[PDB]
């Protein structure tokens, strides 16, 4: 569970992301594709080339969803229900891949927010992504 | 493999007693039921709405036999699973888009089916050697992913 | 989330275990130690040899806790508070390990409850062990 | 260890810019803070009650530097990690009883640390090379477990 501290940490670091969320979402995806190539099996229909608009497009959607979870940090299960259903029933992404993306998202933020990416913030952001992943995977079976 | 002659013989000897037809259909079926998301690759098989519908689906059973067959033949090249599954590794990557994590889910299901079938015979030391083989197989199959 | 069918399946299967749970606890550990030798790092103080009373006793302890969990399948979090505490703040076993013991437990049940280890029951027990795993690692951070 | 020549040059060029003293302390400190369960091996280190207590603990800093010291040496023998890390693997197993999963957590933390420090210089492709490396090191450190 996320503590008040965590909550403050996340709103703060995400606060800084602001308008770059979309681009950071795209970048986390590319990092993931390059470091964990097995994740590509889920996007056979995508142009995964550098600067692919499909990836750009996708990065934004993911960032929008994270932004929405931050806005509803106290009711994530409900704020993300629809996305939980989609992933459980249609996409059927194996659960292990959530940890991979989470990891690439953390690397992206670190790379962009040197001043805010403190030990404390890092830990809060990691618990946060773990919680988002748990929600998205809750309806799998 | 990092199989001990003793470990090799145990694997080999239990396998000799296996009905691939039955074990193949049961392993794949149990997979589809325990880990529902693995069904994303078998939409064309039909109705997998229930344990019963999965366990009974002939397409499932027949796919199961094909998979354990290939597995079975790999036990003959236990000293080069890599070379034995190369082509199958590319296929799974490039044509099927199967996440290699699935190879590990199956392996564990396989071990549960064997324990199920052999009771007493499937001892801790025997499971240990089989765990090494299933891992080995999954690694070989995942080897050509890019 | 354990469905009613699941809760039923579990209570039935565990029902058949009866006076052998302790022996099955012991057997699952033995299978874990041999199949996943990295798990032994948590028991340096034990005699991990076959038939060790240390291993036997621990086997009962684990079995017992599972029993209590089946019994309170509706209130696991509460039924296992203390155990969740112990693991998070004292033992501090890495979360990956819970999946290994869970697996050795299925294998043991399967080998001992042929008739009862149906595909539907297998699925339920797995979810159950997963739930139990979540509970035991919920206070880690 | 599928390090292409170009991946190896990239690992090496960046490693040239690292202050192992500093990176070592940050990586270790951050692990104890992010995954507090890992604190189980350091009860003799004193106060690890808060982030500042961890990050600033002279013992954590000193150990971090030692750990990264051994890692840096590993980077000079990318060809023979197993050999390079063999006595250390044995020690971690037999004397320290350190669950190898700990080696993979540290690797991920380390990647975040390099990202933190190098910013934009830690490109998608450089991260992918480092990912292969931390995994190879974790594997080498676990090779002697039994
Ligand atoms: C916290 C992590 C994640 C978030 C927030 C997330 C969110 C989303 C969103 C918002 C969409 C678009 C749905 C729509 O069409 O409106 C989506 C689609 C998708 N996601 Fe997830 N996702 C996550 C993890 C993953 C992972 C780890 C994978 C696989 C490696 C994945 C694979 C997919 C796929 C294949 C689609 C469909 C894309 C398309 O066809 O356009 N997702 N996700
Ligand atoms: C022990 C591991 C496995 C082995 C040895 C194996 C082997 C095979 C073989 C020999 C084929 C025949 C296809 C051909 O030659 O054209 C096949 C096809 C296929 N496999 Fe795998 N497989 C394994 C695991 C899996 C898993 C776990 C999945 C998904 C859950 C999977 C999904 C498929 C699919 C979708 C096909 C194509 C069947 C069709 O054409 O309808 N495989 N596999
Ligand atoms: C299925 C999940 C598990 C359950 C229900 C469980 C239950 C228990 C119980 C009932 C105890 C004894 C408490 C006491 O001594 O009063 C215990 C202790 C312990 N458990 Fe857990 N356990 C689980 C998973 C694990 C795993 C996966 C590991 C490590 C691989 C582990 C490591 C330990 C250790 C080291 C002890 C203390 C041993 C001793 O010094 O006596 N546990 N656990
Ligand atoms: C890159 C991975 C690692 C490397 C290269 C490494 C290297 C080392 C070295 C060189 C030593 C000193 C050996 C000696 O005392 O003779 C050491 C000791 C130690 N390591 Fe590791 N280490 C690694 C990861 C870890 C992790 C992740 C942990 C725990 C989470 C850990 C726990 C310990 C402990 C507890 C000691 C002994 C400290 C003491 O003196 O009390 N190591 N390690």
CA distance A116 to chain C (A): 21
8 Å CB contact between D99 and D16: no
Both structure tokens of A78: 């409900």
Interhelix angle D101-118/A96-112, rounded to 10 degrees, is: 30
Q: How far is the CA of D128 from the centre of ligand 3 (A)?
A: 37
Task: Using alpha carbons, list the distances in angstroms from residue C95 to B143, C39, D105.
Answer: 27, 11, 12
Q: Ligand 4: which atom is nearest the Cα of residue D103?
A: 27
Which residues in chain D are contacts of C141 at CB distance < 8 A?
34-37
Nearest-angstrom CA–CA distance, A43 and D34: 31
The counts of H helices and E strands in chain A are: 6, 0
The candidate with the shortest Cα–Cα distance to B111, out of B14, B21, B5, B37, is B14
Which residues in chain C have their CB less than 8 angstroms from residue D40's CB? 92
HEC-encoded secondary structure of D55-121: HCCHHHHHHHHHHHHHHHHHCCCCCCHHHHHHHHHHHHHHHHCCCCHHHHHHHHHHHHHHHHHHHHH
CA D120 to chain centre: 21
Q: Which residues of C, range 5-64, sit inside 8 Å of B by Cβ?
A: 27, 30-31, 34-36
Among protein residues, the one whose CA lies closest to atom 24 of ligand 1: A98
**Nearest CA owner, ligand 2 atom 2:** B103
Q: How far is the CA of D92 from the centre of ligand 4 (A)?
A: 7
C35: helix, strand or coil = helix
Nearest to B101 among A88, A94, A140 (CB): A94
Query: DSSP letter at C68?
Result: H
Distances (CA, A) of B80 to B20, C44, C84: 22, 35, 44
The count of structural domains within chain B is 1
C3: which 2 tokens? 């469905």
> In the PDB record, what is the listed experimental method?
X-ray
* HSE-up (13 A, CA, CB side) for residue B6: 4
Whether chain D has a CB inside 8 Å of the CB on C96: the answer is: yes
Find the CB nearest B97 among A41, A92, A97.
Answer: A41
What is the least distance, in Å, from the CA of C105 to any CA of chain D?
Answer: 21
Q: Which residues of C touch B115 (CB under 8 A)?
A: 107-108, 110-111
Residue A128, number of CB atoms within 10 A of its CB: 25
Residue B6 belongs to a domain with what CATH number? 1.10.490.10
Closest by Cα among A108, A99, A129 to A38: A99
Rounded to a whole number of angstroms, the distance from the CA of B39 to the nearest CA of chain A is 9
Give the ligand with the smallest distance to the CA of D136: 4
d(C-alpha D54, C-alpha A6), whole Å: 18
Provide the resolution (angstroms): 2.1
Taking the C-alpha atoms of residue C36 and residue C31, their distance in angstroms, rounded to an integer, is 8
Whether the CA torsion D55, D59, D60, D65 is positive or negative: it is: positive
Residue nearest to atom 36 of ligand 4 (CA): D96
User: Residue B40 gets which letter from DSSP?
Assistant: G
Interface test with C, best of D32, D33, D99 (most C CBs within 10 A): D99
C18: left (phi over 0), alpha (psi -120 to 50) or beta: left
Q: What is the dihedral angle through the alpha carbons of D58, D61, D65, D68, rounded to the nearest 10 degrees?
A: 160
The answer to whether C111 and C92 have CB atoms below 8 angstroms apart is: no
Ligand nearest to the CA of D27: 4
Do the Cβ atoms of C105 and C129 come closer than 8 Å?
yes
Sign of CA dihedral B138, D6, D126, D141: positive
| Residue among D115, D120, D124 whose CB faces A34 most closely | D124
Interface test with D, best of A111, A114, A117, A120 (most D CBs within 10 A): A111
Identify which of C110, C131, C134 has the alpha carbon closest to the alpha carbon of residue C122.
C110
CB contact at 8 A, B112 and C35: no
Structure tokens at C1: 């989330």
Cβ of C70 below 6 Å from ligand 3: no
CA trace torsion A109, A111, A117, A119 (10° rounding):
110
Residue identifier of the C-alpha nearest atom 12 of ligand 3: C61
Torsion of CA C88, A117, A77, C74, to 10 degrees: 0
Q: Tokens 């953390």 appear where?
A: A106
Ligand located closest to B23 CA: 2
Question: Which residue, among B26, B54, A18, D64, has the nearest Cα to D54 in the 3D structure?
Answer: D64
Under DSSP, is residue C28 helix (H, G, I), strand (E, B) or coil?
helix
What range does the domain containing B133 cover?
1-146
CA-to-CA distance for C68 and C64, rounded, in angstroms? 6
Q: How many CB atoms within 10 Å of residue D68?
A: 25
**CA of residue B91 relative to chain centroid, distance:** 16
Q: CATH topology for A1-141?
A: Globin-like (1.10.490)
Nearest Cα residue in chain A from C128: A141
Residue appearing with tokens 């990318």: D78
Q: Which two tokens stand for residue B56?
A: 């009974």
């Amino acid at each position: 569970v996320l503590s008040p501290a965590d909550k403050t940490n996340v709103k703060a670091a995400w606060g800084k992301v602001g308008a770059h969320a979309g681009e950071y979402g795209a970048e986390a995806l590319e990092r993931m594709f390059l470091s964990f190539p097995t994740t590509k099996t889920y996007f056979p229909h995508f142009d995964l080339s550098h600067g692919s608009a499909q990836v750009k497009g996708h990065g934004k959607k993911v960032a929008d969803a994270l932004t929405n979870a931050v806005a509803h940090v106290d009711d994530m299960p409900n704020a993300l229900s629809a996305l939980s259903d989609l992933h459980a029933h249609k996409l059927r992404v194996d659960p292990v891949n959530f940890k991979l993306l989470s990891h690439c998202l953390l690397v992206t933020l670190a790379a962009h927010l040197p001043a805010e990416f403190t030990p404390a913030v890092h830990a809060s952001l990691d618990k946060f992504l773990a919680s988002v992943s748990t929600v998205l995977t809750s309806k799998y079976r | 493999m990092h199989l001990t002659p003793e470990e090799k013989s145990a694997v080999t000897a239990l396998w000799g007693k296996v009905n691939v037809d039955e074990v193949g259909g049961e392993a794949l079926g149990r997979l589809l039921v325990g880990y529902p998301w693995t069904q994303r690759f078998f939409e064309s098989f039909g109705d997998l709405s229930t344990p019963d519908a999965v366990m009974g689906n002939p397409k499932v059973k027949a796919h199961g036999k094909k998979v354990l067959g290939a597995f079975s033949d790999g036990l003959a090249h236990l000293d080069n699973l890599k070379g034995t599954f190369a082509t199958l590794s590319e296929l799974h990557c490039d044509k099927l888009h199967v996440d290699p994590e699935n190879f590990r889910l199956l392996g564990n299901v396989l071990v549960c089916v064997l324990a199920h079938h052999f009771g007493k015979e499937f001892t801790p030391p025997v499971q240990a050697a089989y765990q090494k083989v299933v891992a080995g197989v999954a690694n070989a199959l995942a080897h050509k992913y890019h």
